[PDB]
Ligand binder design. Structure first.
Ligand SMILES: *C(=O)c1ccc2[nH]ccc2c1
Ligand SMILES: *C(=O)c1ccc2[nH]ccc2c1
Lengths: 302, 302
């Protein structure tokens, strides 16, 4: 029993975190096999409209100081891939896990290993919001921290941290260096666009709550998908699709509550609020747990 | 910016997790140097009033199967220490970190590495509640999962998981095998006692919110410690002491808001509610972040 924001164990990623320094800029890099990946912003200096192709042509291998704990790694090649740099080093990381570089969808979750000066500091769960930002926790020095999921000892890296936007939310790239969302690694007035609530995730979390014994929000009503989606639009929730209904199939069967029956509960919660009650220790409707997250953590017993 | 429930990186603990099997019971153990620590419940069978001294006298070393990944560890000694067992093995764990066994106080937080069959599954933050339970997330097979904090590469182990109580909350021991709270490792009608809210933690989290730009709950008023404590009693909050005020000193100085000024905000929130607003993404007053947790995660800039 219980339900927590639960990250994947971070050990496989900790053994890949290094420090990259170019001039007076220090940030984090990811060392896999004989390559270190880091944000190309490490080659910036005193910001408005940098030409990174020029900045990189002017660098030499010896300009990049890479430190893995107390060992310096000799850089033997450098190249740019979109908004990341690839620093080839003379030593393969003996701790490299099985890994993949995946790009995630908005509404999916991942674990973040926040690092500073190449040293891991903390681990937490994040979701990619519909507007392609993440609500992270990052301070100065966090550039190059990574996001990931783990499946049967394979690490799927999905996020490298770059910047903080004016509202305090965060933006970054996949490990191919392509930004999530309409953001750029330079100084502009860019801001997060309007966001929405991830409906399928809210429904998954109501299922988690039922599995854990919170039932007060259930009711005898069932709604249609079309009628529910009319309510979702009013409250800035994303539309629910039949694929979403299908994905919720296992949790629906385990609790015996049809997906469209739970939707009638969600409509009532949106229209009435909670009237002073809580669900899984929260007084708001939580949207940062996917159906997979609920299945991973919650009992399987039907 | 940002504020998340952030665990310590779990790698140093993952390398210590093993599987202990005695008969048809399997659970987790912690392998440090040449000793494996696990709940003594592993020697139970088909529960009401076990005499563990008798159960252990009837065991031999060969009855305990210890597996570290795909390597079996040969047990060469066994002994009981309160509610844990100490299984001496013929091999020191080459991955043992610097460590200490500490016992924590109610109101303090730690990270939990949830494990199953000796394999780590997830990591999350927990607080020891005033009634000595934890609100964890654990399924069958989780016995022997551990709680810990990390400080300059030293792991302070503070919790080993034993059981789930009827309300779904959890109880366990320190690594000396002494239970937190009035609980026992046998079948009884034991239940969690009445709980309270951890006032100093709520104040720390309001400071986190100020540091992160949420200011709507601030006001021009200051209260006395005695008058605040009258309000705390009414709302089932713990009393605030001068030591608590002192501990909040650094956060008070960083934000420029005196502790007793913030207390006037907390009184108003308790008496009026939030009127539809949120603080750090929550619609309730959060009490599972200590002042140390806030300092660890939040900007230091005054
Ligand atoms: C770190 O990767 C970083 C710092 C500041 C920035 N501004 C635009 C992109 C970045 C990246
Ligand atoms: C596991 O350590 C465990 C399972 C069930 C129990 N009942 C009382 C104590 C325990 C411990």
């Amino acid at each position: 029993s219980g339900f927590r924001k639960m990250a994947f164990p971070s050990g496989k990623v900790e053994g890949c975190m290094v420090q990259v320094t170019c001039g007076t800029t220090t940030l984090n890099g990811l060392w896999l096999d004989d390559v270190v990946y880091c944000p190309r912003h490490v080659i910036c200096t005193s910001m408005l409209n940098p030409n990174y192709e020029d900045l990189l042509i002017r660098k030499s291998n010896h300009n990049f100081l890479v430190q893995a704990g107390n060992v310096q790694l000799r850089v033997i090649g450098h190249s740019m891939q979109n908004c990341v740099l690839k620093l080839k080093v003379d030593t393969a990381n003996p701790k490299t896990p099985k890994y993949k570089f995946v790009r995630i969808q908005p509404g999916q979750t991942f674990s973040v290993l926040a690092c500073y000066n190449g040293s891991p500091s903390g681990v937490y769960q994040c979701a990619m919001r519909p507007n392609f930002t993440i609500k992270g926790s990052f301070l100065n020095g966090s550039c190059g921290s990574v996001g990931f999921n783990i499946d049967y000892d394979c690490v799927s890296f999905c996020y490298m941290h770059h910047m903080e936007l004016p509202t305090g939310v965060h933006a970054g790239t996949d490990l191919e260096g392509n930004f999530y969302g309409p953001f750029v690694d330079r100084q502009t007035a860019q801001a997060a666009g309007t966001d929405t609530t991830i409906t399928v995730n809210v429904l998954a979390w109501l299922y988690a709550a039922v599995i854990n014994g919170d039932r007060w929000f259930l009711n005898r009503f069932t709604t249609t998908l079309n009628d529910f989606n009319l309510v979702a639009m009013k409250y800035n929730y994303e539309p629910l699709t039949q694929d979403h209904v299908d994905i919720l199939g296992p949790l629906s069967a385990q609790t015996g509550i049809a997906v469209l029956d739970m939707c009638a509960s969600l409509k009532e919660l949106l229209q009435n609020g909670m009237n002073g009650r809580t669900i899984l220790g929260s007084a708001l409707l939580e949207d940062e747990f996917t159906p997979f997250d609920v299945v991973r953590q919650c009992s399987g017993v039907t």
